[PDB]
Structures are given as structure tokens and as C-alpha cells.
Amino acid sequence: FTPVVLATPIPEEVQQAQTEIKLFNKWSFEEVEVKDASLVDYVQVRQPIFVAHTAGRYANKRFRKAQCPIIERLTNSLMMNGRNNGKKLKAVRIIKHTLDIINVLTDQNPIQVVVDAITNTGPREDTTRVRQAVDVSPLRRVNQAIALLTIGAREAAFRNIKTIAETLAEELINAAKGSSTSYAIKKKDELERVAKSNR
Amino acid sequence: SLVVQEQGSFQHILRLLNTNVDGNIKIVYALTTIKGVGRRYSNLVCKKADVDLHKRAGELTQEELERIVQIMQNPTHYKIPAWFLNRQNDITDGKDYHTLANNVESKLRDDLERLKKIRAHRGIRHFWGLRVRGQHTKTTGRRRA
């Protein structure tokens, strides 16, 4: 299918980006849909990116943070514990390895898997210290979902054999499938439990 | 890597120069249990004896163990520089050893005892239990117990 070649010898696996439907270096990007209808316009798949390193100004304004690619948002949220401040190359390599593990296990378009996981672990209701049950906006839902997922992956990869990428993969898989065996879902239902007791 | 079945030649925790060496880790770091040999001394010994550093003491050998012991007790003759040893120009002979036994503690207490017997400041500080290398005792190492 149009195997064009260049004077610089490079594999055609990189030229295969735009010859057909645009997609990641490895993963299709068009077949992503949020399973809910509320968190739309805050997950920013499509626009697609070639790698989760879009170093763009996303903090000058209030709501520009929402249009950042969600893969880069999770890559950024991996950049914690102080020691791993910075090291965006490390974070994006971890994200690549995690997408690969989600591909190996019930692939389901791993970027779509993480989208579904974030939507399923975004807390729909919280409590404010007045303790009154208030609602949660989609932006807070997305940021809290990403924070819970990365924190669970962080404290699962902490002091154990399995690497950060696979702890992240198993956390995101359990959040996408909506099982209460993982940290993000457990803490989301913990936050949602005090909704009838705080009204 | 290969077949290491060795149903009868496998070694559990073993005895080497008066202390117990764990056969479940590579020989270089297994040797570091001996009080007197550290990371680089063990690394030098285990490959001066040309033994495989990628395998543990549990499968290493039975004779190269004693060869490693000998290369440790007599490093100077067997092509090892003086500066690599922990006790050179010891106190009274000028020739260099490397104390590898339950004897490095004995030589340390010997140095402390001769310092205290000759009434040097360092020996006096060691007798009192205070810091001896010019540290500030005002705020650090208070409990020390």
C-alpha cells in the first residue's frame, strides 16, 4: 500500500503513520469513546498525538488543562514522590510499557481502556468540610480519577517485585472493568459511600 | 542459562573462615559477610582466582573456595598492590596485611588499647566513648545507644 521510500534509510513502519488512518506509533487512536456521556469534552483523545510528550502551556488559564491529551495527563500524574519530579522521559517510557501491558491483556485499545478506567473511577460525589455531600464537576472527576489511579499504581509498585508499568496496567484494567479489588475503585466507592450519610 | 540440576553438589549456607557464608547470593557479595572483606576486595579476589562471578557460593566449587580463602589471606604475594589492603604498615613491621578473620575487630581494639596506654587524645576519646575525628558533639550522636 504505497511503499514510498526516502533517500534517508528509515523503516517504513514510521512512514506507515499517515498512509492509512492516523494512529499512535503502535495503537489505534480513532476508536476511543467514553462509556459515559458526562466526562465528554474533558478527555481529549482525538486530537491524537505521536507520543505523550506534548509540552504545551496548560496552566496559564483555568480550563485549558482539560484539553491536554489524557495520556499525557496520566504521564504527568506519574511524576510524583519528589524523587521522580521531572523525569518526563521516564514517565512516558512507563506509560508506553503500561500501554503495551494493557495490549497484552485484553487489549481493547489500551488508550480506550485507560479512558474507560478514568471515567469509571471519577468520583461523582464528594464531601466538603462544613461534612456535606456536594457534587463533583467533570474536571475534578477526571483529575481525581487520574490521581487515584497513579497513587494506587505508585503504592502498589512501591516495595514489591512488579514494576510501575505493570502495577499501573493492573490498576487501569481493574478500573476499566469496574472491579472493587483495586485502589482507585475502592477509594472512589469510599468517597461515594458518604453521600446518603451527608445530606 | 544452562542446566544446573546438580542434585547432590548444591550447597546451602556454608562455613568459610570462621563465619557463615550464604550460598544463595553471588560469591562476591556472599563473601562480604566475612568481617574484613568488602565489595571491591571481594570483587578483586573472586576474579583474581578467576572464578565465575555470575554464580553463587552454593554452586561455585569446593576447592576454589579454599583457593579464595588463600588468595585472601596472602594477597600481597599473589599480585595485589599494597594500597588495596585495609591494614598496611600495621604498627610495628612496615609490611602490609589485610585482616580477614574475626581479627579485624581484634586489631581495632589493639590500636585503641595502645592509644589509650600511650595516652594519646584519640585513645582518650575512645576510652570516653566520644567522637574522635574532630566532630561537633554538641548536637549530633547524643543517645548513641
Binding site: 533517500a7 514510521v14 505521536f50 506534548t54 504545551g56 508506553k96 | -
Partner: protein, 137 residues
Amino acid sequence: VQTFGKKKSATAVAHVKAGKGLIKVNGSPITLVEPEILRFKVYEPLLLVGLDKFSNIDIRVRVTGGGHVSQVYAIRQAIAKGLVAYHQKYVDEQSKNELKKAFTSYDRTLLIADSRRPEPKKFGGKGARSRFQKSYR
């Protein structure tokens, strides 16, 4: 024919000349920028506009002055600006406009240099804003 690219402090000078698709970064091909993860970040301005699309031009960049990521962004934008300027000068103007629109619809500072500069540090604390820890008692 000669464009530049900067991200924070790195500057990459791009020379675009009549040639046959030679994309050199420091004398090596574009396949040897070697952060091993931003190689696609240097591939962006090719796969954006045209897969090869270019048997008539040669791009030779030289980058210095920043850090690894700053240089990677500097070349990834210098080569795009060189392509735009080449189409502006020689090839065609509607072609230049279409290719610039294709660049901007994916813009990752491929065409406009990032304006963020390091804020000067002020006394009383490490960094421009963070202050030394203060104790009352």
C-alpha cells in the same frame, strides 16, 4: 534557506537546500537523535505534512545551547520552519499555506518558538518563587 528554532535556550539552525531528501541532525540521520522516545517528536513535521513528499529538498540542522529535550524540540521546529521557508521562497505559496495549516492544526510549537523563559531567582529562597522555610519559635 536558513531558519532557526528555540525552545528554552537551545538553538537549532536549519539549512534547507536543493537536494535529495537528506535529513541530517548533527551529521547523523534523523534516526539517531537518540532520546529513544522523542524520535517521533523529531518525526512530527514529516508525517504531519507529507510521508516523503520531498525528493527535491535537503535539511541539515545544527543545534546547541540547551538540554536534551530542548534541543529535540528545537530541531523538530527548526526543520518545520525550514520547510515552510523553502516553500515560501521557491516551491509555492498555496502549498506553503496548506502545509503551515497542517502544521498548526497539530502545533506543538512546531512553528512558533515557546515563549516561556526561566524566571530570575530572588534572594531569600532557592528558586524564583519558593522561599526558605521559616520558623517562629
